[PDB]
């Protein structure tokens with residue numbers, strides 16, 4: 001069978017938390033007043049929710065109302081419980097309220113308002129300092145939720161809100177987030193294709209927080225190299241081949257051999273043999289100002305097949321890449 005895996009950090013956090021903390025199916029939602037919020041305009045319609053700009057008329061403050069699409073109640077309460085567990089954490093989106101929406105007959109999550117700019121728009125103008133700064137801000141959110149026993153499992157630019165005017169960042173859409181329990185096998189059908197960790201693409205279910213670090217690596221690669229997205233697979237199988245053309249097939253086999261994982265036999269005629277590449281090959285005159293030896297070394301240490309070999313969020317925050325970022 002497959003070799004079990006454990007997170008190398010925050011392994012037992014949910015073990016020594018009270019059951020109330022992670023047993024989200026037993027959570028009791030405290031409903032606010034749905035009439036407190038006047039929807040102003042629709043912002044987006046995802047697979048699991050519609051997001052609206054609204055005003056809390058009890059304080060005349062802009063808020064964001066996320067009306068969930070009809071899904072299993074465990075998944076709704078998972079997100080709610082995770083949001084309430086992480087509330088107040090660094091750069092975690094703040095769940096201000098939960099109301100029962102009378103039209104959808106589904107919970108509407110009310111969040112703080114973040115004056116976001118489009119990441120396609122934003123990532124075109126981000127400076128080298130801007131990238132390191134926001135990466136560090138994402139790392140604060142990731143280390144916090146990991147330290148709280150939760151993996152986001154959907155880290156991608158669309159889930160990173162940035163008010164660039166006030167240099168404000170929020171990690172959002174915790175609808176795929178899960179509590180990490182040692183030895184638990186998780187759904188591999190998480191994260192967007194371009195940001196899926198190799199563990200997902202090889203169907204290894206006993207993953208952990210390190211999944212988010214791969215996704216963060218994919219984001220960093222897309223920014224400093226100005227290639228959106230970096231690993232641009234056409235499906236989940238071609239996705240792994242895209243990664244294997246950069247990280248090499250031999251370390252891929254080392255990875256699946258370490259965990260006694262077997263590749264889908266459909267990889268036999270599409271994977272091929274690929275050397276591991278040096279990150280300098282992706283540097284060119286149009287992105288070189290975003291690249292540094294620290295950037296490449298940091299990226300190198302995030303994008304590792306072996307989830308157990310990736311930098312943890314805290315380790316990533318110690319990296320020389322962030323030495324130039326002004327601390328507070």
Ligand SMILES: COc1cc(/C=C(\C#N)C(=O)Nc2ccccc2O)ccc1O
Nearest residue numbers: 043051064093111114115116172173174
């Ligand atoms: C989808 O899941 C979540 C979404 C959010 C928040 C937003 C979204 N999407 C949001 O504020 N967007 C936005 C704001 C201002 C201008 C343009 C915008 O698109 C918060 C928590 C979630 O869980």
